Amino acid sequence: LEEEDVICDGCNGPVVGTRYKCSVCPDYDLCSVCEGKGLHRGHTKLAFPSP
Ligand SMILES: [Zn+2]
Ligand SMILES: [Zn+2]
C-alpha cells in the first residue's frame, strides 16, 4: 500500500517518535537527532508525536 512517511530534511533519515515541523519553511521536518544537534534553530518549529 501507499504510505506517507516523514523524512528528515537534515539527515534524510526517518522521522519517528517526535517530529519537529517548521512553522515557516514549507514541508520541512527534523528528527529528534537533527533537532538535538540544533539544526534549523532560527525558525519556530512544531513538536508533536510522529506515529
Ligand atoms: Zn535527522
Ligand atoms: Zn524554517
Residue numbers in the entry: -3 to 47
Task: Please quote the authors directly.
Intriguingly, the autophagy adapter p62/SQSTM1/Sequestosome-1 was recently reported to recognize N-degrons, the N-end rule substrates of the well-characterized UPS, and where ultimately these substrates are delivered to ALS8,9. p62 is a key selective autophagy adapter that plays a role in the degradation of various cellular constituents such as misfolded proteins and their aggregates, malfunctioning organelles, and invading pathogens. Intriguingly, it was recently reported that the central ZZ-domain in p62 plays a critical role in the recognition of N-terminal arginylated BiP/GRP78 by the Arg-tRNA transferase ATE1. Here, we present the high resolution structures of the ZZ-domain of p62 in complex with 8 different N-degrons including type-1 and type-2, and subsequently identify key determinants involved in the unusual recognition.
However, an understanding of the manner by which the ZZ-domain binds to type-2 substrates is problematic since there is no deep hydrophobic pocket in the ZZ-domain, which is known to be involved in the recognition mode for type-2 N-degrons. Therefore, we determined the structure of the ZZ-domain in complex with a variety of N-degrons comprising three type-1 N-degrons and five type-2 N-degrons. As described for the R-BiP complex, two aspartic acid residues, Asp129 and Asp149, bind to the α-amino group, and Asp147 forms a hydrogen bond with the first peptide bond, which means that these interactions are conserved in all different N-terminal residues. However, the side chain of the N-terminal residue of the N-degron is recognized differently. Furthermore, the hydrophobic side chain of Ile127 guides the orientation of the side chain of the primary residue. Therefore, relatively small and branched hydrophobic residues at the primary position might provide very weak (or no) interactions with the binding patch of the ZZ-domain.
